[PDB]
Symmetry: C3
Subunit: 167 residues, 3 copies
Amino acid sequence: GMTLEARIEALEKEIQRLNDIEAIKQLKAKYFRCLDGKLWDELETTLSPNIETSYSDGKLVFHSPKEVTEYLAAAMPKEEISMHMGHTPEITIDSENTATGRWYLEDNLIFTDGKYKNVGINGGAFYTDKYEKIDGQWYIKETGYVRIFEEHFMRDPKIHITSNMHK
Amino acid sequence: GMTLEARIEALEKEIQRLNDIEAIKQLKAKYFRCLDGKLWDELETTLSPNIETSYSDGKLVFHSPKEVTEYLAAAMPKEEISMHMGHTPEITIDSENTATGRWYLEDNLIFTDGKYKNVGINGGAFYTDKYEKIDGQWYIKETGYVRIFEEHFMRDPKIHITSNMHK
Amino acid sequence: GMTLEARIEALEKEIQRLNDIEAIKQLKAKYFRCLDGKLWDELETTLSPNIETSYSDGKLVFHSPKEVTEYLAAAMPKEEISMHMGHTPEITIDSENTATGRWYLEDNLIFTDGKYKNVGINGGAFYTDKYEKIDGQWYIKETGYVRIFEEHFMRDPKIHITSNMHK
Ligand code: NA
Ligand SMILES: [Zn+2]
């Protein structure tokens, strides 16, 4: 049936897809690691320079990955321990340089100091991301979510936090 | 040594395996997303028409994916927030159209209304699934588990749930 | 441009990388499953015979996978329910037989009996592992971490544990 050339072409396309899926999984992994490590300069490298600006009365218009990370740093201050835990991705490669990804998030936040001292926040969400490939590298272009649930409460003050990377 | 044809054949087999593993990971991802989103019609599409009926005095015999989802809907009512979080899969492709998968589950359930209002249930489990491929698509054929642990308790009624997709 | 031989060689290298990444993901999955199942003999099979001995005044020098599992068994006794939950791996294949992996850990520990009866411990950590390939199989060579946070507390004694695989 098919020539060797045709069989090779098909393999090259299939492998490129698998390589792209794996790169996008590591991209999102790096995003969560840097977000929760508060490694803002490194986090910035996961964001597309063309990161999508979702339009709405009262929301911010971001002009750059740097502005996005300035917002995240303000939203995730030193006093806030965060864990953003990604599960069970569904990655679809839409074209040579675009992709979509679903991620199942669990998040746990603990405020250790300041106005929200001893507040805990837990929740879950289904994210839907868009990614884009620029010069052989994948970036996050747009990231949105539907909350499963979210809750807040006061932690028992007797809970002993014995390690905190942000201290 | 090997002819180009032989090297290509080997690549085609290896790539088919990786494609099948990735499809099975996205299959199980879709299962959890739809289960926790209570998207029962969509959940049904993840189940094999030949879904295995585990025989035991007092258990139900399912005749179709639809009957399985009717049971799940009764087991996971609107008043129950659920998170079924899959980790660290071990997927083995057993033949061209069959596979086995191990998944590490964490689950968190919260009842918001009705008889179990303010009950929380947490646990963990090791699942072992069987999958089957029909017309180029993977389906869940059988799904079983060993519980690591399970616990229940009354939640502090002062916990503020601020978002709930089921409301 | 490239000969068919060159295109095949490239595919073989790319596929070997993807196969190695998937094998390393299943390796770490098996590690967590056996650690939390307290399946010490099986856990041992995930560890390199050349498992790295991190040098420090007061620490143990391990001579074998078996000694490592003896330590883990002492550190994770029957009375301790553990869940070590791996997320969002970043696996890099460094050479034909070496690799590095980042994993995002959440851990939850519950003591059911003995000196720490009713103690809970929760936390998170970023692991950085080294792996090595011996006779076609990947093994864990070195495993280290930075804690995000760790906390301990007394559980409400009214929490009903209804299943425990270690009982
Ligand atoms: Na959790
Ligand atoms: Zn998790």
